[PDB]
Coordinates of C-alpha atoms in Angstrom, one line a residue:
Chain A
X26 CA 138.8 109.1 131.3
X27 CA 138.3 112.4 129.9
X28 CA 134.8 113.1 128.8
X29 CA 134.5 115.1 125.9
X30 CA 131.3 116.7 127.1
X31 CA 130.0 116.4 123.7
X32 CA 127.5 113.3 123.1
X33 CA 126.6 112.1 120.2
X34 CA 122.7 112.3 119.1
X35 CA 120.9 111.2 116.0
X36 CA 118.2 113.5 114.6
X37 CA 114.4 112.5 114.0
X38 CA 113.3 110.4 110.7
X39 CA 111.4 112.5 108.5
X40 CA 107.1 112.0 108.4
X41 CA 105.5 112.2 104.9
X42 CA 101.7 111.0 105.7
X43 CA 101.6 113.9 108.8
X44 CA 101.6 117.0 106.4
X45 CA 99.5 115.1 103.3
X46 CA 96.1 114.6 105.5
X47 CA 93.5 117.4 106.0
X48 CA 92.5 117.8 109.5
X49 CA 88.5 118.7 110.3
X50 CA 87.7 119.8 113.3
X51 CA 85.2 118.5 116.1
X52 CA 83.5 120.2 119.1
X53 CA 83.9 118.2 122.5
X54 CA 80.4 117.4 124.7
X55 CA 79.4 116.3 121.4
X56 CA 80.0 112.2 121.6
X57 CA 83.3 111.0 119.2
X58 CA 81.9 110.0 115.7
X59 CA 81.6 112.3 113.0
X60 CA 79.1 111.9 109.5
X61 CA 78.5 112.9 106.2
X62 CA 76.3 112.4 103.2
X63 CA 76.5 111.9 100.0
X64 CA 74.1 112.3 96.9
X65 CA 74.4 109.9 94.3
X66 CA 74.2 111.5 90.9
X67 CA 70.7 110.3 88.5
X68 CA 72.2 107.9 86.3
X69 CA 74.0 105.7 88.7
X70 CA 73.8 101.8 89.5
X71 CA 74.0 102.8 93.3
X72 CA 71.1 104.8 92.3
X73 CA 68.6 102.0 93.2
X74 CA 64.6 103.7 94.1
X75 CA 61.1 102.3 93.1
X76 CA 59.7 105.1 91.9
X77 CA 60.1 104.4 88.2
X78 CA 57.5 104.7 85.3
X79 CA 58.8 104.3 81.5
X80 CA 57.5 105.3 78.7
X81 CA 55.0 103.0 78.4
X82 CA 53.3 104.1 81.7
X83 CA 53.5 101.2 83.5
X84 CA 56.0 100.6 87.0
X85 CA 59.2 99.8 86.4
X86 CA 61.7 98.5 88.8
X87 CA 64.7 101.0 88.2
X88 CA 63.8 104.4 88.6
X89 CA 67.2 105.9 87.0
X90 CA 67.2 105.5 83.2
X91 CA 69.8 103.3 82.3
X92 CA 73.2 102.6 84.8
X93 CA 76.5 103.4 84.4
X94 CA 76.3 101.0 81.5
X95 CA 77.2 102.4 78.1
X96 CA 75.8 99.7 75.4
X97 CA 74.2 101.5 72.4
X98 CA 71.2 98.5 73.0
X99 CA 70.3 99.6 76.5
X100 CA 70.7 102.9 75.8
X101 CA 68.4 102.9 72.8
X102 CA 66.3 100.2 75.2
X103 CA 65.7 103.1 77.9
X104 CA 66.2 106.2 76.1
X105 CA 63.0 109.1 77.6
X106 CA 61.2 109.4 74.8
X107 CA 57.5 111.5 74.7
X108 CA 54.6 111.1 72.4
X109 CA 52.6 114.0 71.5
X110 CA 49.6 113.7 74.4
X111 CA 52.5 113.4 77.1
X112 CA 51.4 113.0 80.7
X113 CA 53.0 110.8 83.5
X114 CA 55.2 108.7 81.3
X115 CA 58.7 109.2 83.1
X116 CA 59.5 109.1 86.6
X117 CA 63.1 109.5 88.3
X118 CA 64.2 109.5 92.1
X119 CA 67.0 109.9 93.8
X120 CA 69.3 108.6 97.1
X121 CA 72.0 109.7 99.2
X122 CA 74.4 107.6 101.4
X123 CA 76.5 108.4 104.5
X124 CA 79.7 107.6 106.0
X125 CA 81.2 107.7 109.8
X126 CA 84.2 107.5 111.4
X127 CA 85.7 107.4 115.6
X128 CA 88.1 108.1 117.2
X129 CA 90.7 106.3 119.7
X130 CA 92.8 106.7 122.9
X131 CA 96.7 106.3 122.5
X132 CA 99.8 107.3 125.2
X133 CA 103.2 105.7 126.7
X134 CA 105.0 107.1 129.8
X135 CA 108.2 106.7 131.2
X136 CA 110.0 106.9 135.1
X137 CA 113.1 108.4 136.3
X138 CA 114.4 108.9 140.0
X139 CA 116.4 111.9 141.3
X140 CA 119.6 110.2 141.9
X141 CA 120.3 108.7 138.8
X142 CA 119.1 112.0 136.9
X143 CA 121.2 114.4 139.4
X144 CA 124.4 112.6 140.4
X145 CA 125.2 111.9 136.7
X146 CA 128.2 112.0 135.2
X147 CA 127.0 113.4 132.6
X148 CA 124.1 116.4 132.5
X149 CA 121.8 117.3 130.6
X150 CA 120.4 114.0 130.7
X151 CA 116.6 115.5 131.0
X152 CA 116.3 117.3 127.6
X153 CA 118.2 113.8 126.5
X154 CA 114.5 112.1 127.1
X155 CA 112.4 114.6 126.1
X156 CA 114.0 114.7 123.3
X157 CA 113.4 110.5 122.6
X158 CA 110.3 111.3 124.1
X159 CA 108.9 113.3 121.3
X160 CA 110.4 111.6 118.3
X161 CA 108.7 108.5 119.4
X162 CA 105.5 109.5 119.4
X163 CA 106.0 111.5 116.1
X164 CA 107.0 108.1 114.4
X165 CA 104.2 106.4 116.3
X166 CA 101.4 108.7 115.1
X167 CA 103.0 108.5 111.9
X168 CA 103.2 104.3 111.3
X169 CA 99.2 104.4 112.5
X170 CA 98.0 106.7 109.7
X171 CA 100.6 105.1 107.0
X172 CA 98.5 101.4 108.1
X173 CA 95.4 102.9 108.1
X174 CA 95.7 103.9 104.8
X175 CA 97.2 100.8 103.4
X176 CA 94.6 98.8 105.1
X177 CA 91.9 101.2 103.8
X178 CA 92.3 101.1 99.8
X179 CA 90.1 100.7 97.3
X180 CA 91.2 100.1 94.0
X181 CA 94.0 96.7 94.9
X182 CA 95.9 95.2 92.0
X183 CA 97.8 92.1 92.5
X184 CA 101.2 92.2 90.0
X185 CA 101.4 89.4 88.2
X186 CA 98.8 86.0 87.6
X187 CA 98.1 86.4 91.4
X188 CA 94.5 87.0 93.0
X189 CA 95.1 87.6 96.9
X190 CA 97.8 88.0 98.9
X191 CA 98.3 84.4 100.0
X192 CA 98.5 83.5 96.0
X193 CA 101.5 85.9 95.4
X194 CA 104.9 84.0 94.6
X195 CA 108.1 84.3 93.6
X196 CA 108.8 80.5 91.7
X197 CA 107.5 79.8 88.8
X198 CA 106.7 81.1 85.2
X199 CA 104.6 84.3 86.2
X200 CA 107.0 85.7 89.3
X201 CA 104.7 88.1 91.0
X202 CA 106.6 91.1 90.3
X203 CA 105.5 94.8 88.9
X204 CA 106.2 95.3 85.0
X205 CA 105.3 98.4 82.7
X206 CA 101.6 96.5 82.1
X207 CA 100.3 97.0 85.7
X208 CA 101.5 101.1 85.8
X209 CA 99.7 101.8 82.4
X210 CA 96.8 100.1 83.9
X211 CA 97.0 101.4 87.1
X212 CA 97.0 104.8 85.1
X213 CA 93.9 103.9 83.1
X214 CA 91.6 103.2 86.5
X215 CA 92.9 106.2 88.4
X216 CA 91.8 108.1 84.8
X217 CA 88.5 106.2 84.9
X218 CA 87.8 107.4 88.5
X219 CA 88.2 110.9 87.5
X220 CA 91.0 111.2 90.1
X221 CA 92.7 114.7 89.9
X222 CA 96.4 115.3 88.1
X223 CA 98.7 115.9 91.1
X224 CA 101.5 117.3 89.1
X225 CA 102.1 118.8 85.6
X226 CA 104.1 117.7 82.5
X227 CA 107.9 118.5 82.5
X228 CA 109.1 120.1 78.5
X229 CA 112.7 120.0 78.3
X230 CA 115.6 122.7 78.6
X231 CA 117.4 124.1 76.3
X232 CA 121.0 122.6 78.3
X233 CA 122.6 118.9 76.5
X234 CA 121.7 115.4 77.9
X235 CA 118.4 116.7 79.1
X236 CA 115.0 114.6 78.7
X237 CA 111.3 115.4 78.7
X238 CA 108.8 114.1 81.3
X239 CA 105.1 113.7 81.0
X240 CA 103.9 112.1 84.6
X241 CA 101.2 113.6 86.9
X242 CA 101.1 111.4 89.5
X243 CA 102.7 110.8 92.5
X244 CA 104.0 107.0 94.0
X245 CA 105.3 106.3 97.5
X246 CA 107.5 103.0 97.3
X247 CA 109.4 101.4 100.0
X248 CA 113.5 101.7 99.7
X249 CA 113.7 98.0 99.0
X250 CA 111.4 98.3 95.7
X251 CA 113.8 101.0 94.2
X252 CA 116.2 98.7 92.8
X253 CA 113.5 96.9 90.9
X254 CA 112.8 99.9 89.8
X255 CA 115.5 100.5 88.4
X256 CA 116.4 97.3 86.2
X257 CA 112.9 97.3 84.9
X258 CA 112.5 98.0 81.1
X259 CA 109.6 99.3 78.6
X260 CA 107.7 97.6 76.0
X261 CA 110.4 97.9 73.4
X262 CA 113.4 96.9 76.0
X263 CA 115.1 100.5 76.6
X264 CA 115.4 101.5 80.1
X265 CA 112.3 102.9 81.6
X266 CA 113.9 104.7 84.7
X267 CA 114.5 108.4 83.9
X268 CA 116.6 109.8 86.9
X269 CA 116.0 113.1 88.7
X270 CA 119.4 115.0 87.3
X271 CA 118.1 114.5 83.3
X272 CA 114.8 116.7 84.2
X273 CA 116.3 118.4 87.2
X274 CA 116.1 121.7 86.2
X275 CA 113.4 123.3 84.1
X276 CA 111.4 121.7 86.5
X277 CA 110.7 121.0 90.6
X278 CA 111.7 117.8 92.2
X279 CA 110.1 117.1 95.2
X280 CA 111.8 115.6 98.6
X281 CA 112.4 112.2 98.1
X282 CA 111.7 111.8 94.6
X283 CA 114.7 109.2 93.1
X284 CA 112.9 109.7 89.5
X285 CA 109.9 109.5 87.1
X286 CA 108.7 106.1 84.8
X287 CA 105.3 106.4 82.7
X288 CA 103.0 108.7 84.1
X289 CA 104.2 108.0 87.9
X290 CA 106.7 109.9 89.4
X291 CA 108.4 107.9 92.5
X292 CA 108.4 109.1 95.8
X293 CA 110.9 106.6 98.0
X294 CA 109.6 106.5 101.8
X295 CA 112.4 104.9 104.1
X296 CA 109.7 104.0 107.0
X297 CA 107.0 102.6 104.4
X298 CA 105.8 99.1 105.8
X299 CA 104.9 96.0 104.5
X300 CA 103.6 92.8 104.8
X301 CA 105.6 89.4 106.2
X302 CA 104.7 86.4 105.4
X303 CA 101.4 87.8 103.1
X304 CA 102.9 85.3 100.5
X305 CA 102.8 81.8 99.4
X306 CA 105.7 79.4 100.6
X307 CA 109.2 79.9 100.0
X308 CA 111.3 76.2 98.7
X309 CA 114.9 76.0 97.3
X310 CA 114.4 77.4 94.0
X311 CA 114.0 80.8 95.4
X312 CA 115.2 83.7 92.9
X313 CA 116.7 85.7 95.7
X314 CA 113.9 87.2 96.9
X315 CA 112.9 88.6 100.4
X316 CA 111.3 86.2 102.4
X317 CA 110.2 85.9 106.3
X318 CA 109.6 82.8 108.2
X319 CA 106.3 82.2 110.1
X320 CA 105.9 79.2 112.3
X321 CA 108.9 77.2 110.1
X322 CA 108.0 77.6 107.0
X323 CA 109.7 80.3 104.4
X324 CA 107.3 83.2 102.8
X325 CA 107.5 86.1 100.5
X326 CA 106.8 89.9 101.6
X327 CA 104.2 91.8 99.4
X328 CA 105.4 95.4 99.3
X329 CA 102.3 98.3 98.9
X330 CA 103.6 101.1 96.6
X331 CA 100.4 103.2 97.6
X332 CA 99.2 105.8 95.6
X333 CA 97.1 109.2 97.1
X334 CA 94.3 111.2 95.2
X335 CA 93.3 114.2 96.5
X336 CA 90.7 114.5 98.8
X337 CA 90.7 110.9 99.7
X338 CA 90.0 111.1 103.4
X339 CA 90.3 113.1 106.0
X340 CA 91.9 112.8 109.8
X341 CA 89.1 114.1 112.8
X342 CA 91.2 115.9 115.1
X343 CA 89.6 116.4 118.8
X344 CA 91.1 120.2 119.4
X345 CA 93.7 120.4 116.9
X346 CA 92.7 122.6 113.8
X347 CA 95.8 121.6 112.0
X348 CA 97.8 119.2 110.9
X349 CA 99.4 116.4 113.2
X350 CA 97.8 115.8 116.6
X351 CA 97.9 117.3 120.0
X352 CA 100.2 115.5 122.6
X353 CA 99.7 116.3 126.3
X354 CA 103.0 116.3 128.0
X355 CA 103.3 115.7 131.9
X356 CA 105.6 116.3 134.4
X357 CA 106.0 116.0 137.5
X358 CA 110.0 116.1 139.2
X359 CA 110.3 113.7 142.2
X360 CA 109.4 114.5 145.2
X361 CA 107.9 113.6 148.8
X362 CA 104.3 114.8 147.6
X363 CA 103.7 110.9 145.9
X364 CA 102.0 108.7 148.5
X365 CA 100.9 105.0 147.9
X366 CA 99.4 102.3 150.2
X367 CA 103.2 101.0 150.5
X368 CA 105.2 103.3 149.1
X369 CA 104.3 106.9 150.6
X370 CA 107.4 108.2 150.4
X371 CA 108.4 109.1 146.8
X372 CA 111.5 109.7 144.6
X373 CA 110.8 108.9 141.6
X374 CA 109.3 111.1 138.8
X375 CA 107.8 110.4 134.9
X376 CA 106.6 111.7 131.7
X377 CA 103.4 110.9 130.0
X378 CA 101.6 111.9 127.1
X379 CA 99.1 111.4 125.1
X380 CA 96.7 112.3 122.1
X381 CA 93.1 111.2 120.4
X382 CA 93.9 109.9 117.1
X383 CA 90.6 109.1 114.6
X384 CA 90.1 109.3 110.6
X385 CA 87.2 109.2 108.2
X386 CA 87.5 107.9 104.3
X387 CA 85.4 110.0 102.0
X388 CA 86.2 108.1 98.3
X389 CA 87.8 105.2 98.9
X390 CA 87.7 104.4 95.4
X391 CA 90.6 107.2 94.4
X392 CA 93.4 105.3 97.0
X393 CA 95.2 103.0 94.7
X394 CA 98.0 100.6 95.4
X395 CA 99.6 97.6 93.9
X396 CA 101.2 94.4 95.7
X397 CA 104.4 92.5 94.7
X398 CA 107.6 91.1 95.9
X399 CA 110.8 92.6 96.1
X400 CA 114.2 91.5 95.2
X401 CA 116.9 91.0 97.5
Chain B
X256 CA 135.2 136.7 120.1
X257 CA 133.6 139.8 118.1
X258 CA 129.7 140.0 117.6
X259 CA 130.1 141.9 114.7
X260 CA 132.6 139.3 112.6
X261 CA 129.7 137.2 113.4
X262 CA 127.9 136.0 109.8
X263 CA 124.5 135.2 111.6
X264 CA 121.8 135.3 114.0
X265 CA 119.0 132.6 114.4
X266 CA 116.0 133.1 117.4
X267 CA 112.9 131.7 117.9
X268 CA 109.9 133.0 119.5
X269 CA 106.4 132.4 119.6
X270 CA 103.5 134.0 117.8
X271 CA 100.2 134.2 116.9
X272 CA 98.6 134.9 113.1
X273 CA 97.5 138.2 114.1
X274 CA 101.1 139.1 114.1
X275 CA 101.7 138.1 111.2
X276 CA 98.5 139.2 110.1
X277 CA 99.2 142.6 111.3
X278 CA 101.1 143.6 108.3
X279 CA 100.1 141.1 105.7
X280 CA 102.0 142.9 103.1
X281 CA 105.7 141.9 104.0
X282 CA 104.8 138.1 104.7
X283 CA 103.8 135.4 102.4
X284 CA 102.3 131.9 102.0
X285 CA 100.6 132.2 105.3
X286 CA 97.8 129.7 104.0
X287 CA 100.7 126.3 103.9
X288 CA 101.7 126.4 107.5
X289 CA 100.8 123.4 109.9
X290 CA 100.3 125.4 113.1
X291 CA 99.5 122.4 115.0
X292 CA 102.6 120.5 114.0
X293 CA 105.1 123.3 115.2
X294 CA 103.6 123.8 119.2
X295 CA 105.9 124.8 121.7
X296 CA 105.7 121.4 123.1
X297 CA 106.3 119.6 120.1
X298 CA 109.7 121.4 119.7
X299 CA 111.9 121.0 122.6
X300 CA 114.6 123.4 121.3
X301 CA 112.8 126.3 122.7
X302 CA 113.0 126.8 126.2
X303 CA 110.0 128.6 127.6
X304 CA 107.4 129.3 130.4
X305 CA 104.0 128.6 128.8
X306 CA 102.8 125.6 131.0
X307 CA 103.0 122.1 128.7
X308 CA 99.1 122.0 128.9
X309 CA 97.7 125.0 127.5
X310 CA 96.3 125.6 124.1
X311 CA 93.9 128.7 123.4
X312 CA 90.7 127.6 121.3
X313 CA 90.6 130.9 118.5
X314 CA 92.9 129.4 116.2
X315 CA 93.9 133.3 115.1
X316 CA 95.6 133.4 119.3
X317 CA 97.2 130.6 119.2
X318 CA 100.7 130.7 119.6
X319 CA 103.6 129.1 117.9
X320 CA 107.8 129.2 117.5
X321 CA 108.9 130.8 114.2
X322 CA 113.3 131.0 113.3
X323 CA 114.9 134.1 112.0
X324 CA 117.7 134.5 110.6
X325 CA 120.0 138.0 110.3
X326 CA 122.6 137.5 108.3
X327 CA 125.0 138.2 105.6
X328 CA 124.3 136.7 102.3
X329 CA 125.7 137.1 98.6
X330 CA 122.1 138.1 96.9
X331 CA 123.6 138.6 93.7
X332 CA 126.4 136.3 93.3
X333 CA 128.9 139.2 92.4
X334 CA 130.6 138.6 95.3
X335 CA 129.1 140.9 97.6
X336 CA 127.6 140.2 100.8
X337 CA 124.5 142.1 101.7
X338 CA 122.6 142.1 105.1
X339 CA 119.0 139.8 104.6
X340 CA 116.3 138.7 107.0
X341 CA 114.6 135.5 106.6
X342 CA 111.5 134.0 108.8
X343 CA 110.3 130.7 108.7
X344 CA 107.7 128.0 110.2
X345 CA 107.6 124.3 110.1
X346 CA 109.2 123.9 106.5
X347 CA 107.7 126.8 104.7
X348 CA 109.5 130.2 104.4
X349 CA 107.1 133.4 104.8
X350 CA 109.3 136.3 104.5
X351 CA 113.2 137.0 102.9
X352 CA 113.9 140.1 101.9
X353 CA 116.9 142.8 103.0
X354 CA 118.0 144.2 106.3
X355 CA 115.0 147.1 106.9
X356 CA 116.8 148.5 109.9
X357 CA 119.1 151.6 108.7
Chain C
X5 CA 97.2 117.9 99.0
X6 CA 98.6 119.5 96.1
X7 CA 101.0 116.9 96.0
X8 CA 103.6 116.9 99.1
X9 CA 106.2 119.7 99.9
X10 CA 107.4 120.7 96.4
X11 CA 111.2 121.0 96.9
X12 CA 113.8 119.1 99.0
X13 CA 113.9 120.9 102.5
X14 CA 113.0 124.0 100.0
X15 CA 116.3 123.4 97.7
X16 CA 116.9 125.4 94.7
X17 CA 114.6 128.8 94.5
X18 CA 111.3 129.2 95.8
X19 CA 111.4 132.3 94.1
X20 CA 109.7 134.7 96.9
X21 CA 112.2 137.5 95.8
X22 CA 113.3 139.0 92.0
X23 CA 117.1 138.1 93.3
X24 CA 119.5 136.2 91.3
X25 CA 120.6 134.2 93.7
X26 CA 118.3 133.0 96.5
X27 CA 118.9 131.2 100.4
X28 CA 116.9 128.5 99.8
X29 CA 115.6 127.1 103.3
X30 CA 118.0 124.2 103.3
X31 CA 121.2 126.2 103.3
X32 CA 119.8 128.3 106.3
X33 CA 119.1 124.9 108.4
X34 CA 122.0 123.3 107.5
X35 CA 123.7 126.1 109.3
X36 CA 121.8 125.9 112.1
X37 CA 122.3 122.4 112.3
X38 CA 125.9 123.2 111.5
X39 CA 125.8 125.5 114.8
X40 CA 123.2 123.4 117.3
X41 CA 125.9 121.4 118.6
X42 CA 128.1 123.5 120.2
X43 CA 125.4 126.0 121.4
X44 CA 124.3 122.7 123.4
X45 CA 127.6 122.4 125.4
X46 CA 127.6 125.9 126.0
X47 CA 124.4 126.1 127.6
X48 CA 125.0 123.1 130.0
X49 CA 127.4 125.6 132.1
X50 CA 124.4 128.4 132.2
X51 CA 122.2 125.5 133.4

């Protein structure tokens, strides 16, 4: 055998949640939770005081003048009006909430000895497992945050006639799948809860076989959604699916974008998760959709397609500043210094690290995300 | 086997914003830049001395590995190749422009 | 925020310069990814 001294190594899967968060700082000898407040505005329903007098003069049990409801009757029920002689007729108060977060412990470590690393036949076998090393944790810190913020969402619709997760199906008349419907609505809540515009319109170019696009926002969807993506269709049947090299110039694409429908613009993920067994039971008149089996019985995955408004939440870093964490790295190369109540000797070394990981949601009404199946 | 055939040059080193700070005419885009993401420890490319537990606690002296490159490159597409310098961090590029040196 | 990292590994212009034609930061890795692996053997013999 000839060894070709050249070995083969495969590279480190690329982290999109990481560089999205905001980091805030957080000074140590100064316990591990971190608080805010916030001030609800005067005409809110989570506006809710006792000091309330209407125009009558007389106590009234809701000191803000009318909710968040927008009826011309209560409106023209609780409008502030003043008479002529006007003196302690209207009385308004206000609240303010707060919010908290932690943070939590996380490392792995490895061993090694000094023969197997040494007498090798082949070297170099040390930057080899730092090198694993580091990508691990990478993808480790990575898949936390990514679950946190799926478990975390606040505005959760369920594609198709289904309610929870346990309800979503892939027999019957209504499959549980997403449709042109659910984006346009999505669309409409994210509008209602003044979420900012992440992106800006697209106007054509002046080159043939070019096409205009008019989405600002941004969707992260797993790769197995994509095909579905794909075959779906608008309201009046033409494809809705409009490709990255129609709008490719005269415009920026950003990485990992595999094209634009309605107002969203796709994002594909490769290491976005989801859910197994979440759905109802699988029988013999399966489309062909994924399923998973749980304790003998078929079920259908629910896949996220998670949406991000700005300034949703932010990441509490212990001594970091920046984005991602701080890892401490050990090491220590083998030696006789180890000693042990049966093993004094020593000749084996490791590698451990480490890193305080916490985050705090601000507005949890501005994440978004929508649940369905996806095809085989 | 000739250094100056060669098309290009990459290093990396470690600095602090104050260097780049120093003259904040030539770079750019200093605000983008994940300064925790790129530590020495968190790449293992570059091979250095710093102990693997040390961090300072300014964030303007902290220090992190930044990439040149010196190289030849066709600026204009006419077919000629011109000497350029390029610097970046992470993923964001913070300085390209020609070769200063005469 | 401000959306995620605008172009793919900085393809096509990120117009820092008035040049015609510009590097782009993926051409520049790609190169040194081009490069990485041979560096690596090499080094193995200093070590």
């Amino acid at each position: 055998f000839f060894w070709l001294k050249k070995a083969i190594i495969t590279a480190r899967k690329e982290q999109y949640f990481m560089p999205l968060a905001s980091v805030t700082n957080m000074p140590k000898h100064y316990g591990k939770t971190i608080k805010v407040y916030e001030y609800v505005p005067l005409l809110d329903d989570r506006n809710i005081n006792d000091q309330g007098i209407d125009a009558s003069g007389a106590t009234i049990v809701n000191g803000n003048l009318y909710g968040s409801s927008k009826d011309i009757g209560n409106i023209t029920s609780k409008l502030p009006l003043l008479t002529e002689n006007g003196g302690r007729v209207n009385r308004v108060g206000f609240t303010r909430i707060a919010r908290e977060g932690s943070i939590h412990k996380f490392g792995f470590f490895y061993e090694f000895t000094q023969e197997s690393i040494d007498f090798d036949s082949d070297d170099g076998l040390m930057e080899h497992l730092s090198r694993e090393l580091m990508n691990g944790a990478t993808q480790i810190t990575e898949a936390v945050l990514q679950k946190d913020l799926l478990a975390a969402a606040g505005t959760v619709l369920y594609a198709g006639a289904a309610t929870s997760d346990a309800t979503i199906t892939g027999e019957g008349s209504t499959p549980s799948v997403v449709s042109y419907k659910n984006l346009m609505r999505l669309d409409q809540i994210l509008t209602e809860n003044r979420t900012p515009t992440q992106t800006t319109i697209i106007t054509g170019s002046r080159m043939i076989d070019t096409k205009v696009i008019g989405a600002t926002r941004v969707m992260y969807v797993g790769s197995e959604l994509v095909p579905e993506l794909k075959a779906m269709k608008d309201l009046f049947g033409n494809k809705a699916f409009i490709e990255t090299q129609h709008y490719a110039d005269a415009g920026t694409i950003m990485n990992g974008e595999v094209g634009s429908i309605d107002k969203f613009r796709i994002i594909q993920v490769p290491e976005m998760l989801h859910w197994a067994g979440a759905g109802a039971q699988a029988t013999g008149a399966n489309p062909g959709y994924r399923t998973s089996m749980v304790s003998g019985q078929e079920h259908y995955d629910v896949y996220p397609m998670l949406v991000v408004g700005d300034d949703s939440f932010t990441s509490i870093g212990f001594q970091t500043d920046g984005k991602s964490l701080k890892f401490t790295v050990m090491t220590k190369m083998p030696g006789k210094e180890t000693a042990d109540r049966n093993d004094p000797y020593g000749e084996t070394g490791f590698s451990s690290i480490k890193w305080y990981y916490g985050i705090l949601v601000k507005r949890p009404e501005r994440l978004a995300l929508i649940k369905t199946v996806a095809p085989l | 086997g000739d250094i100056n055939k060669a098309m290009f040059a990459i290093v990396s080193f470690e600095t602090c914003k104050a260097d780049l700070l120093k003259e904040k005419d030539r770079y750019h885009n200093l605000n983008k830049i994940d300064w925790q993401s790129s530590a020495p420890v968190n790449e293992p490319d570059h091979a250095t001395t710093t102990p693997q537990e040390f961090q300072i606690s300014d964030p303007m002296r902290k220090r992190v590995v930044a990439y040149e490159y010196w190289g030849f490159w066709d600026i204009e597409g006419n077919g000629v190749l011109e000497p350029i310098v390029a610097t970046w961090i992470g993923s964001t590029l913070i300085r390209l422009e020609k070769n200063p040196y005469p | 925020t401000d959306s995620m990292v605008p172009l793919p590994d900085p393809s096509q212009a990120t117009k820092l310069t008035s040049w015609k034609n510009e590097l782009s930061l993926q051409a520049l890795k790609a190169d040194l990814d081009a490069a990485k692996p041979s560096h690596t053997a090499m080094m193995i013999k200093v070590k």
